[PDB]
Structure 1
Amino acid sequence: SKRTKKVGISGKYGTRYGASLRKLVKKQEVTQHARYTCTFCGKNSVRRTAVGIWSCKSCKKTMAGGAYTVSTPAAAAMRSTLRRLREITEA
């Protein structure tokens, strides 16, 4: 009862569009439909609404994030360095 062996979420596309494109869109589609744990209230009730907007179903707060992920590696690195940079500069 696995119904597949490798296709996964990209099984709706049947036999169209070519193997490599189907396999390559899976990377973003699987993480876009997922569900993440909130940061303000702690519940696991965060889902995507628009192309860059995320919102918690329980506290009703809304946050601007990545395109297909609640956060992106580039943004996280910048915040850490900037926080480190500011503290030493003001000390």
Structure 2
Amino acid sequence: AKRTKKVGITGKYGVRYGSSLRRQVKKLEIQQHARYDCSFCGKKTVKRGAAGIWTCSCCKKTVAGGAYTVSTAAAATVRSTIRRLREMVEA
């Protein structure tokens, strides 16, 4: 059954630390504990491995990433920027 109404993974913190602080920790704990899809083998098996380290259990491949997500919006922006720059330099 649905055990909690809104605390989710932050139910371990009880009544401590403030609800805004627990809601702020919640969105990043869900992200860092989520399984992500491997870019290399297509399976959704990528775990977090001491933040910034995103390891796929199958195929044993490790990607440097964000602290709580495998990819950040800034890094996706940077890949698009380097892709555009490389395409306009070597063409």
- Segments of structure 2 that go 5 or more residues without pairing to the other structure are none
What's the counterpart of residue 62 of structure 1? 62
What is the alpha-carbon distance in structure 2 between the residues aligned to residue 46 and residue 28 of structure 1?
16
- CA RMSD of superposed structures (Å): 1.0
- Segments of structure 1 that go 5 or more residues without pairing to the other structure are none
What is the alpha-carbon distance in structure 2 between the residues aligned to residue 77 and residue 88 of structure 1?
17
What is the alpha-carbon distance in structure 1 between the residues aligned to residue 30 and residue 87 of structure 2?
38
Once the two structures are TM-superposed, the CA of residue 78 in structure 1 deviates from its matched residue by 1.0
TM-score, scaled to structure 1: 0.93
What's the counterpart of residue 20 of structure 1? 20
What is the alpha-carbon distance in structure 1 between the residues aligned to residue 46 and residue 90 of structure 2?
36
What is the alpha-carbon distance in structure 2 between the residues aligned to residue 56 and residue 90 of structure 1?
33
What's the counterpart of residue 8 of structure 1? 8
Once the two structures are TM-superposed, the CA of residue 69 in structure 1 deviates from its matched residue by 0.3
What's the counterpart of residue 77 of structure 1? 77
What's the counterpart of residue 34 of structure 1? 34
Amino acid of the structure 1 residue aligned with 2:17:
Y
Once the two structures are TM-superposed, the CA of residue 89 in structure 1 deviates from its matched residue by 2.2
Which 4+ residue blocks in structure 1 deviate beyond 3 angstroms? none
What is the alpha-carbon distance in structure 1 between the residues aligned to residue 86 and residue 43 of structure 2?
32
What's the counterpart of residue 50 of structure 2? 50
Once the two structures are TM-superposed, the CA of residue 87 in structure 1 deviates from its matched residue by 1.5
Measured against aligned partners, the alpha-carbon deviations of 1:41-87 in whole angstroms (never above 9, x if no partner) come to 11111101112111111101111111000000001111112111122
Once the two structures are TM-superposed, the CA of residue 90 in structure 1 deviates from its matched residue by 2.6
